[PDB]
Each structure stands twice: as C-alpha cells, then as structure tokens.
C-alpha cells in the first residue's frame, strides 16, 4: 500500500496473509478475506503457481509475533472457471480457498461482510484498501498492516481513454488514482472496504495496477467487483 498509514490491530479483522513456503520459511505473497471460518476469498492471480500456501489470520506484523496469529493450511483451491492468467484484463480474478481447518473468531479474527449481489457504488464512495504490499513502486513489503483512503471511480470514468480505457470491465471497481495513494505488489487478493449503511463491506478484491507503477495519476487500483460473483461464491461454498 503506497501512501498508506498503519492500521489498528482490531480495525480490519477479516484481512488475511496468503503466504507460500519459500523453502525454509514462509513468504507473504498476497492478501485475502476470511468469509467463512474455513473459507477464504482471494484473487486467482495469487494462486496461479502450484506452491504450498498457508493463511494467517490475526496478523499485524509479518516479521513479529503479534500473539494473535492463527496459522492454517489450504486444503482446496477453487479458481473461477473463466480465469485466464494471460488475460487479467478479462476479469474473473477471484479464488476461494477451503482452509484445512476452521479459525477461531475473536476481535482480531472476524468474517468479511459481503455485499448484496449486483451492488454498484456511486462515484467517490468512501473505501479503504488494506494490505502488506509495497509502500513504494519497486519498494518493499510493509511490516505492519497498512491502510489507505481509496475512494471510488465509476465505470463511466474509469473506462475513459484518459484513465484505463477498455482494460477495465464492468465487473471491476476502480479506486484512487490520485497518484499519491494506491495498491501495490503484495496487496493482491486483499480487500477494498467500503462504507455502506454505516457498515464496512468488502466490495473489492485487489487485482492489478499500472505496469508503469503503483501510484499513477489516473491509473486507479483495479478491484474484482465482489458483488458480481456473489452467486458463484455461494454455489461453490454450498457444493463444498
């Protein structure tokens, strides 16, 4: 998260760390959202490479024992049947991970409130992006959980040639683009918390940024519009 601040331990308690076993130890590759005690919603782009994944709930400082962490393995990976790695611009960048076991919900570990199917936010809607991603373009991962005020840019504007053009599908949410604040390498799959009816719901799944860099003016962080997939998310979880 570029241009972000340090979050409070209990602030965003659905936020997970998707780590892969890099030989000796575990490395943070992506973000995620605990939707069930045994189900995790991340980006398909994260689970492309056949690695050994573990999900850590209750994380704050990757490199330091927070005393609140729960370490659970991923028994099952369900990537959206239309996900085509070579065409992230096509969308469908959403995956569901069935955890080897259920996590214990506390003030550090809660479930992510999903939006109503088909829900489109208005332009400039108050959203936050959280994650342990690069604080700078080509920089390094944040030790502690960073948060940034990333208001929304509707489809009408985000599909402008001055913005993203046709790279962005209606199935996507755009937030930020101020050139100061954004999402970066590592934030992927992690959650775009939007304030609706006084309640924070996970409207977005961090997909991509501009090849030119993370915090690029008129190149807002593109999220996978969770509200489009609600049906699928339910079907998968119920057949599993």
Swiss-Prot record:
Its main location: secreted. Binds 1 Ca(2+) ion per subunit. The keyword Protease applies. Pfam families: Trypsin. Its cofactor is Ca(2+). It is found in: Secreted. The active site is at residues 45, 93, 188. It comes from the Eukaryota. Its EC number is 3.4.21.36. It catalyses: Hydrolysis of proteins, including elastin. Preferential cleavage: Ala-|-Xaa. Pancreas. Basal layers of the epidermis, hair follicle and sebaceous gland epithelia (at protein level). CDD domains: Tryp_SPc. Ca(2+) binds at residues 59, 61, 64, 69. InterPro entries: Peptidase_S1_Elastase_sf (IPR050850), Peptidase_S1_PA (IPR009003), Peptidase_S1_PA_chymotrypsin (IPR043504), Peptidase_S1A (IPR001314), Trypsin_dom (IPR001254), TRYPSIN_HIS (IPR018114), TRYPSIN_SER (IPR033116). One of its GO terms (cellular component) is extracellular space. Disulfide bonds join 30-46, 127-194, 158-174, 184-214. Keywords: Calcium, Disulfide bond, Hydrolase, Metal-binding, Protease, Secreted, Serine protease, Signal, Zymogen. One of its GO terms (molecular function) is metal ion binding. GO terms for biological process: proteolysis. Residues 1-238 form the Peptidase S1 domain. Belongs to the peptidase S1 family. Elastase subfamily. Serine proteases that hydrolyze many proteins in addition to elastin. This is Chymotrypsin-like elastase family member 1.
């Amino acid at each position: 998260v570029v241009g972000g601040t340090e979050a409070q331990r209990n602030s965003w308690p659905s936020q997970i760390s998707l780590q892969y076993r890099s030989g000796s130890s575990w490395a943070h590759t992506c973000g995620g959202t605990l939707i069930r005690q045994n189900w995790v919603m991340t980006a398909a782009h994260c689970v492309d490479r056949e690695l050994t994944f573990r999900v850590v709930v209750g994380e704050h400082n990757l490199n330091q024992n927070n005393g609140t962490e729960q370490y659970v393995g991923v028994q099952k990976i369900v990537v959206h049947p239309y996900w085509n790695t070579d065409d992230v611009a096509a969308g469908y960048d959403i995956a569901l991970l069935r955890l080897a076991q259920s996590v214990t919900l506390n003030s550090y570990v809660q479930l992510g409130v999903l939006p109503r199917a088909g829900t489109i936010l208005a332009n400039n809607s108050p959203c936050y992006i959280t994650g342990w991603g690069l604080t700078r373009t080509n920089g390094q991962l944040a030790q502690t959980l960073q948060q940034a005020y990333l208001p929304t840019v509707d489809y009408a504007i985000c599909s402008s040639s001055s913005y993203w053009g046709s790279t962005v599908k209606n199935s996507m949410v755009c937030a930020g683009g101020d050139g100061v604040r954004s999402g970066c390498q590592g934030d992927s799959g992690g959650p775009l918390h939007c304030l609706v009816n006084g309640q924070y719901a996970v409207h977005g799944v961090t997909s991509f940024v501009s090849r030119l860099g993370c915090n690029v003016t008129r190149k807002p962080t593109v999220f996978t519009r969770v509200s489009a997939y609600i049906s699928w998310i339910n079907n998968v979880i119920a057949s599993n």
